[PDB]
Symmetry: D2
Subunit: 347 residues, 4 copies
Amino acid sequence: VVRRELSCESYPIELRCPGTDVIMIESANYGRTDDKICDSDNIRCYLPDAYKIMSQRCNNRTQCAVVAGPDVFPDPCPGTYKYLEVQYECVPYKVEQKVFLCPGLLKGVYQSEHLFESDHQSGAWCKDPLQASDKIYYMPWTPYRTDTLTEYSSKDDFIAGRPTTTYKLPHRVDGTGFVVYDGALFFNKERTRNIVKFDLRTRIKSGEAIIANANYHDTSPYRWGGKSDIDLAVDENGLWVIYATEQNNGKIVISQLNPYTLRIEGTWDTAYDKRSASNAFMICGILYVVKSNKIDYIYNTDQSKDSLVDVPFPNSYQYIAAVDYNPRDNLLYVWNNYHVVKYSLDF
Amino acid sequence: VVRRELSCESYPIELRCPGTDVIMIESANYGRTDDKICDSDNIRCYLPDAYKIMSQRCNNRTQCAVVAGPDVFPDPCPGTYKYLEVQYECVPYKVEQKVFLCPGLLKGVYQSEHLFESDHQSGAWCKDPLQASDKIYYMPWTPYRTDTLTEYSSKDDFIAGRPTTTYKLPHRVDGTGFVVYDGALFFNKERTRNIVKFDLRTRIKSGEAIIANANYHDTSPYRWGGKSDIDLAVDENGLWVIYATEQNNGKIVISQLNPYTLRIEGTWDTAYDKRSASNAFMICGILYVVKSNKIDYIYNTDQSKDSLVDVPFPNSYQYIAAVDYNPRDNLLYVWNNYHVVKYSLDF
Amino acid sequence: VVRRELSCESYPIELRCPGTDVIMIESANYGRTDDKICDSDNIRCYLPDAYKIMSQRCNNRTQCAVVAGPDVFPDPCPGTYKYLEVQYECVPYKVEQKVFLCPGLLKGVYQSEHLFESDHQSGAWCKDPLQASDKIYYMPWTPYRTDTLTEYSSKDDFIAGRPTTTYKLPHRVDGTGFVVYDGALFFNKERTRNIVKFDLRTRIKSGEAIIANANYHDTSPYRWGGKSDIDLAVDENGLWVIYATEQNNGKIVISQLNPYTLRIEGTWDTAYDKRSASNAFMICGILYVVKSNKIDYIYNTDQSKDSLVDVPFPNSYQYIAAVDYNPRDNLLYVWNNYHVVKYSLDF
Amino acid sequence: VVRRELSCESYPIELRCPGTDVIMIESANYGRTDDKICDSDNIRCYLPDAYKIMSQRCNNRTQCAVVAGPDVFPDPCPGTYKYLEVQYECVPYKVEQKVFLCPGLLKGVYQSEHLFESDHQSGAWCKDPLQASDKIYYMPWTPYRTDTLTEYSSKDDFIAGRPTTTYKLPHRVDGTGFVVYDGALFFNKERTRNIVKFDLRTRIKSGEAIIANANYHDTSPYRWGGKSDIDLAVDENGLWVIYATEQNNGKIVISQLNPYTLRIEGTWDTAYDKRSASNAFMICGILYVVKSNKIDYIYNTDQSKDSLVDVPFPNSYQYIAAVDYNPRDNLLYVWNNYHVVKYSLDF
Ligand SMILES: *[C@@H]1O[C@H](CO)[C@@H](O)[C@H](O)[C@H]1NC(C)=O
Ligand SMILES: *[C@@H]1O[C@H](CO)[C@@H](O)[C@H](O)[C@H]1NC(C)=O
Ligand SMILES: *[C@@H]1O[C@H](CO)[C@@H](O)[C@H](O)[C@H]1NC(C)=O
Ligand SMILES: *[C@@H]1O[C@H](CO)[C@@H](O)[C@H](O)[C@H]1NC(C)=O
Ligand SMILES: [Ca+2]
Ligand SMILES: [Ca+2]
Ligand SMILES: [Ca+2]
Ligand SMILES: [Ca+2]
Ligand code: NA
Ligand code: NA
Ligand code: NA
Ligand code: NA
């Protein structure tokens, strides 16, 4: 929706966008286009650079204050009493285009970072790839008692055990399949085949989606168990759901979930038994299944074709609780038998 | 609607309200009430003064930033890792209670201030009594060509002819009957018996009300004419409409208009011919009619009783274009034959 | 905000307002004003009655469907392919003007209706005077356990004990001082000097107001006690708060509360000790205090003048728990020692 | 956001969603879970099928009315006075999953339907693939005078020249590159490198996106010219922008545009000169370039790989003004030298 501001010469113009939304200049003029605006003692006074000046000073910002005068703008009509007229919009914060571009085909998964050894055998952690932020999101695994999400301002604060805040979730969580995308938490509602969307900035449930025919609550989890039936994943294409159905004889089923409309945007049936998989993740719309040790299966959703592979994966620890791909830094956010680690990817 | 913020010890809590809305602390606790919030190495840790500290620091403000720690709060439980949990609302800016309290019964109208002599014989001007501001709103009278409202930051800037901004109205204006109340402009839409509500902060029409059976467009104006058929008025009770109907044989009819719901909240029929009145205004729900020179008639809406009076009014100039009462400063904002003046009131 | 609809000849126009909001036609034309609208094989084709037809068919309705054709509209230009263009707004439902007009000065309170004898000694009940509805709202009094409001579709259903719905309140209630106004419940939040606004249609808290310096939780209740410290009241002027302050030595203090902005719009200090009052209510901005038996004191907020009176009140029962005035039907909604009654008023 | 309804036995529950949004049942119970709800003369009374009954009766509907009683629900506790308690959300209308699934690789483009021969040599037309509707959207090409979009209820009404409505656009349109997606019109704003989003249901601009470095206004159009610089396209992946940049030496550049966030989600540089292309379109994230006669070039965005091809295209007419792919019916919506046609696709 179009927002409007106008200030007479020597007065500032004030632009402000709600929450995390940012300014986008639609139009701007410094001069005079009307004989009634800004009462004083030439209605064809235009400054073509007014649009450029306002865009440079205000675009990508939550707020802007610009004085309508000679300190900021050249004079398009000396002698004429001028005014600054601006039309603008509040748009979601911009995202670096690399987040949506495929880095290539996965050659292997390798050790990279070892953050710390937690006192919890299972759990999950990630970053929001749509944000240029150092924020880490952490959800520990406690059977039948998980309903919180802890936020850390950096990796350094995360290792030191220094949280910024904690979120009380509207429902209990089943498994370690959680993801954070564009300021929203996505999780599997305990004892349901539903995904809950929880807005972190306003601390309220912003929606719910039913994952049609998805098996739930220790019916089709990963090898380790722990109610891992439904796993969410983020990649270059958006948000995904990794689960299994009786219709597909307990084999992995993958669906694209629109994070804004909560619609299921395409479903693909794989040939890999979910109970046999230690974990799984998406990269460029391709499902990578972990066996434990190695990636032994891939499913390409773009071609609707699968293949048997022998892609390396770290053999260090046994209890693989969570594996989350990040399309911003191209790293795997892993929870493996108490150890909180980051794995590099070779393309 | 309830808004929530939470920050772990040493981190700041950030409260922000949209537009001109202000913070109201609902609840606050600095301590520990839950064993899962703010992950670290006593769930009955309360600070009773947390509510008082937050209220003092954040109430009546657009924004607030408070660090959850020993610089701002005492320690309710030394050794326990604490967090600040706050529940708050965004409410319209508070108004000094005097604005709604009757100063008394009017003894007379007297000269007080003479701002300047305009080049326009007719027009109208006022301040928003619900705002603690020096802002002046000005609408000149130009037959069939009025569609702007000019704003000045102070009396000083108004006399000097230094405007802050100008508003382009969605429709043309009939007469000098305009008023500003709680950030909204109220005016009579040209060639209609309708009142338009225009939000000044967002620069959009926020509503419309039809003044049932009101005479319009030089049918029942004030003595001077100029399409003065419908006059808006602000007092201790709110917003009023001063007009005339054929049902009341062209005599003044007064209605209370709710500025928030746009409903007509009571209508009273007077015995004064509107065409004979130079102008009129409300004080404490009492209509005061000007003849030119003197106030010769009053109508009390609380009692539904009228009386003939001889209340003094300045005899200086003839062409009385506008008379607007202000319940904050208890002054009359008058436009009389080019002269822009303020009249004092003796109670 | 302006809403727009347009349909080519023979097609229907569909107008819809959210919730309880109603249509108000701003403008309408059946004909042709543009050479590009409604593509077919005269751009000055107007029907003046189009505005009248649309207003008659759509005003005061939640929804409207009108066919753009000869069954509903005359032909302003035969041969020319026409279209119906409408501009409209969604406004709060209209209210009969009598609700805001003073019936007169109270001569006495008299018995009228005896609905039923409840099993609860104390409680409160009312109707929403801003709605043309038979709905009754009921709140029983249970010490430290009150957090529900029950709704009945009629008097008949209320006596029979046939509820339509129950509302779970966000907080516990202190006393029997509750009121319903313009679809919103107003109550005193347990162990606070705060008034909570709860929207009944959406079932959420819509705001909160602090009653500055108000005594609360068995400090200054009515004679019967039961945490009656703060009593809400509805009359021709709007919403009121009846309470007491230490600043006024425990004597009744009355404040106008804006139900839309949650602002305190004027405060008046009375000379009647609240602990000595059995109950109190407002009519035309005048406070009427009950002693038990009789009305022995009045306070006129319009004049800021009080008087000692001897106004009759029914002597039938002793334990007067609640007295709520209704400005639509001009009756008192009373709860007296198990008996749920309506009292008439002589003006 | 969660919406709540509750009705006591024999009373109906009413669920309504705004605009085109549909109901999604979150939770439902017919019975008794609380001793205070629905006042009458067992707080563990549950009906497991209540969720199933409500979902079946209300899911995918704008509105729902269900009576809380024995005509619709079995009795989970005879003798106990029951109530129906429902929690629900309003979600965007569901979309058939085929719209997001790739039909295969394009073997050729073939003649299928010939609707009519227009009096306009150039123009554009389409359907909204996210809607299960017969609605056709039409924009004729008139140099420097295009600012309207006409809607037809069916193919039959479109051929007959019987429109339902016309939309007045906030800005003039450059070229025939328009698209309709999820109730929103997307077009290139005249003399700019910007895409405007216009909501058809509310008739207002809902956003704007700048296509960084895009050539505009007869700099890089298709062979026929007519300000075709920027072309929008819809496929299984969403919304795309087909344009050219000086950085890519006037060769086709393709970008994914998020229709909800207005963000550019990935950009790919092709090797095909845009001025040499008659038109272009996307299918499964693959760009197909038309030469006139044949498809002689493809660019796969999933692989970031291009190939020279010889894919058939109808040789019937010369002046190819628009080619729009539809992912619901897998047809090309084409405007070729006055003729309005549909082309089939062989996979
Ligand atoms: C700021 O806004 C401009 C305007 O479109 C956009 O092009 C740019 O990508 C955004 N991000 C940055 C870092 O400038
Ligand atoms: C700030 O907020 C408090 C909280 O109710 C209110 O009492 C006060 O009147 C308002 N205004 C000022 C100037 O403090
Ligand atoms: C319907 O709308 C009209 C338009 O202003 C209004 O005058 C009238 O009072 C309202 N109420 C009824 C019952 O018509
Ligand atoms: C109705 O709602 C259900 C609930 O998720 C959904 O599964 C289904 O796909 C939607 N569409 C139809 C045609 O039922
Ligand atoms: Ca995973
Ligand atoms: Ca006046
Ligand atoms: Ca009372
Ligand atoms: Ca195309
Ligand atoms: Na996951
Ligand atoms: Na006025
Ligand atoms: Na009350
Ligand atoms: Na297009």
